[PDB]
Each structure stands twice: as structure tokens, then as C-alpha cells.
Amino acid sequence: NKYKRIFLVVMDSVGIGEAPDAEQFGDLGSDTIGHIAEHMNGLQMPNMVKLGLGNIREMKGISKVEKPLGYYTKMQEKSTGKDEMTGHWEIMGLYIDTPFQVFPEGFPKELLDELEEKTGRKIIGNKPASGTEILDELGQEQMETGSLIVYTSADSVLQIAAHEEVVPLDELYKICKIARELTLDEKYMVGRVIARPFVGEPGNFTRTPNRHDYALKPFGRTVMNELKDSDYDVIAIGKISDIYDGEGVTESLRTKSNMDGMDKLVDTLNMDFTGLSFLNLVDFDALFGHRRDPQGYGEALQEYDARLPEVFAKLKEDDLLLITADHGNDPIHPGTDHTREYVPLLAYSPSMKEGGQELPLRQTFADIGATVAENFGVKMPEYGTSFLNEL
Numbered sequence: 001n002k003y004k005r006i007f008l009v010v011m012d013s014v015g016i017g018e019a020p021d022a023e024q025f026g027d028l029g030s031d032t033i034g035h036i037a038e039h040m041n042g043l044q045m046p047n048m049v050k051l052g053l054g055n056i057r058e059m060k061g062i063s064k065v066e067k068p069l070g071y072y073t074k075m076q077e078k079s080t081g082k083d084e085m086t087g088h089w090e091i092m093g094l095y096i097d098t099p100f101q102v103f104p105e106g107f108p109k110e111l112l113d114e115l116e117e118k119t120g121r122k123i124i125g126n127k128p129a130s131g132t133e134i135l136d137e138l139g140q141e142q143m144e145t146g147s148l149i150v151y152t153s154a155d156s157v158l159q160i161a162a163h164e165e166v167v168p169l170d171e172l173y174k175i176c177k178i179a180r181e182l183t184l185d186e187k188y189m190v191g192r193v194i195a196r197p198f199v200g201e202p203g204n205f206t207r208t209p210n211r212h213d214y215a216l217k218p219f220g221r222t223v224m225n226e227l228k229d230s231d232y233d234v235i236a237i238g239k240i241s242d243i244y245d246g247e248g249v250t251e252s253l254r255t256k257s258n259m260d261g262m263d264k265l266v267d268t269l270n271m272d273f274t275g276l277s278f279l280n281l282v283d284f285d286a287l288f289g290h291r292r293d294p295q296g297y298g299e300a301l302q303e304y305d306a307r308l309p310e311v312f313a314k315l316k317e318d319d320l321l322l323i324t325a326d327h328g329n330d331p332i333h334p335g336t337d338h339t340r341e342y343v344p345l346l347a348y349s350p351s352m353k354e355g356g357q358e359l360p361l362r363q364t365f366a367d368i369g370a371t372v373a374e375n376f377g378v379k380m381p382e383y384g385t386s387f388l389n390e391l
């Protein structure tokens with residue numbers, strides 16, 4: 001192998017400006033890093049700058065450097081959709097024609113009618129809401145009636161809440177499996193069904209850790225599958241295992257925050273492994289992008305950047321660091337959905353004694369998968385062109 005270890009970091013939703021096909025999505029004018037930089041009167045990201053972030057694109061507080069530590073470019077999404085699954089699945093070598101849908105006005109009556117028909121239960125709610133909000137509003141009615149609270153987030157999810165003392169957990173799980181079956185339909189294609197059991201009394205409801213998820217497997221065997229099948233380590237950090245439904249994962253490390261994510265990345269740097277360490281930093285998307293909070297997003301990016309020098313110090317000559325994103329989620333954009341954007345790509349190894357250069361623009365996210373596959377000598381993905389030789 002050229003590199004013994006590849007550390008892949010997805011800064012979730014950290015887009016670098018509208019893609020050529022942004023108009024189709026209602027995403028004209030969308031710039032995630034750029035609008036955040038303007039809100040902050042200049043972003044403080046000196047370590048990303050040293051890597052060459054400004055060399056990809058100059059933004060307020062983010063300037064180009066004469067000698068970037070590593071190679072740099074941006075990537076264009078080839079798949080139809082801009083959702084959580086699509087971006088990650090493409091990164092690992094796939095092409096996804098069928099997008100996962102979001103439901104800002106709730107689910108179609110046709111879907112909910114069939115769920116009622118199959119379960120013999122009434123459905124209430126049917127709106128985007130946080131767990132706390134929907135239980136405060138509907139928890140009591142749910143307890144008294146034995147109905148199901150169905151709700152969604154700003155991402156492609158269908159969540160079903162029921163009180164543990166009113167609907168047995170095993171019955172809730174059975175209902176979620178039915179919902180999972182009904183939502184494998186492009187009429188209303190849902191990424192994830194989530195059981196949301198709760199306990200307590202009116203005015204004091206709490207969700208329990210008895211949450212179960214019902215996810216879809218990637219539409220194809222991924223580069224992670226190939227690595228695992230060839231006895232390489234595939235260490236998933238954060239939501240990565242969930243996103244791929246465990247496919248090709250050899251170890252999964254749960255994280256509770258972006259800072260915790262970086263701690264787990266550092267943990268993997270300290271591990272003797274051969275293969276891929278794959279981190280998703282989700283706070284950018286989950287806390288700040290969807291909530292249209294440019295201040296919080298900017299603070300999070302600055303907190304993330306400050307962690308990087310320790311990562312640089314720990315990288316070995318035969319380690320490669322790859323930093324990218326999955327889509328955009330511009331915190332100063334209408335609505336609550338993602339934005340169709342280019343994503344940055346930074347590729348750094350301490351063995352790059354002369355620093356890096358500009359790479360040709362990556363025409364699909366699958367170029368990452370192709371590079372990883374070529375490095376470890378496993379079956380190449382159907383899509384994607386490796387840039388390993390350029391490094």
C-alpha cells in the first residue's frame with residue numbers, strides 16, 4: 001500500500017458554493033462556508049487555510065496560501081439527490097438515481113392511511129418537530145388514546161412516538177417495521193424510520209434509550225464492503241455506521257458532539273490499524289444548518305479548526321488525511337432543507353515534502369471511494385476516478 005492508513009473526515013453539510021445544477025433544487029445563491037464567513041466578519045480557520053481551503057475558494061477570513069500543506073480541489077455531486085444517504089453513498093463509490101425525500105409539510109395522506117390500515121391504530125401529529133416539542137403537544141393524547149405520534153425532522157426520517165406503558169416496545173418495533181416496508185417507495189422515499197418510545201406524565205415526558213432505527217442498506221456494495229472483505233480495518237466514527245447500515249464496518253465508535261468526534265479521531269490515530277478511519281462531524285448539519293443558525297455554525301467551524309494541529313502532529317509518513325463534505329446546508333437560505341453545493345476536498349500526508357497542488361475538479365464524490373480502493377488494492381468501484389497517483 002502507498003498509505004497504511006487513510007483518515008476520512010466528512011464535515012457534514014459544509015458546502016463551498018452552489019453547484020451547476022442548483023437551480024433544479026431551488027438552491028441558486030447558496031453558499032454555506034461563504035455566508036457563514038460573511039456573518040462572522042471573517043472566519044478564523046487558520047489550519048484549514050494552511051491545508052489550502054482558501055486555494056479552493058477565497059472567502060472572508062479565508063485566504064489562499066503560497067504553499068498549501070496538501071492537495072486541494074472541490075467535488076461535484078453526480079447523484080440525483082442532495083440528502084444524507086445519497087452524499088455518503090456516492091463518496092463510497094455508488095451512484096444514486098432515486099433521492100430520499102424530506103417532508104416539511106408532513107407525510108402524504110396515502111402513506112398514513114395505509115399505515116393505519118395495516119396497524120389498526122390512529123395516527124396523530126404528522127409534522128416536523130423536535131422530540132420535546134411533539135411530546136409536549138401530543139404526549140397526553142397519545143397516552144389516553146393509544147394512537148401513534150408520527151413526526152419528522154428536517155432530514156429524511158419518519159419517527160413514531162408511543163408511551164412505553166401504553167404501547168409495548170415490541171409492538172412499537174413491529175409498527176416501525178411496517179412503516180419501513182411502506183416507505184421503500186419513491187412516492188415517499190424515507191431514509192430512516194425511527195422508533196421513539198417515551199415515558200413519564202403530562203408536563204414531564206422523556207424519550208428513552210429504547211430507540212431503534214430502521215435504515216436502508218446502500219444501493220450497491222461500497223468500497224467499505226470491499227475493504228472489510230479484504231480483511232482491512234474500517235473504523236466508523238459518529239453516524240457513519242448508521243448511514244451505511246453497518247455495511248463494511250469493522251468497528252463503530254459513537255460520538256456525542258463534534259469535539260467528541262475529534263477525540264475519537266485522535267483515538268484512531270493512536271491505534272495500530274491498516275485501512276480506513278471514517279469520521280462524520282454531524283453538528284454542522286444537525287444543530288446549525290437545518291436550524292438556519294449562522295452564528296452557531298461559524299463557532300462550530302472555528303472550534304473544529306482549532307483541533308486540527310494535534311491531528312497534523314499525529315499523522316505518520318504513510319498516513320493520508322482526507323477532509324470533505326457530503327452536500328451543503330446554507331444557514332442563511334430559505335426553508336430547512338439542504339443546499340446543492342460543491343464540497344471542498346483537502347488531501348494531506350506528511351510525506352508531501354513539497355506541499356500540495358490543485359487537483360482537477362472531482363466530477364463525482366465517488367472519486368474518494370476510487371482513491372481509497374486503489375490505495376488498498378481492492379476492487380475498484382463502478383463510479384469514480386482515483387486521484388491517488390496525483391498525490
Ligand SMILES: [Mn+2]
Pocket residue numbers: 025026027028333334335337338339
Ligand atoms: Mn434551497
Ligand SMILES: [Mn+2]
Pocket residue numbers: 012013083084087285326327
Ligand atoms: Mn450530511
Ligand SMILES: [Mn+2]
Pocket residue numbers: 013084154155285286290329338
Ligand atoms: Mn441534514
Ligand SMILES: [Mn+2]
Pocket residue numbers: 350
Ligand atoms: Mn515532515
Ligand SMILES: [Mn+2]
Pocket residue numbers: 361362363364367385
Ligand atoms: Mn473526476
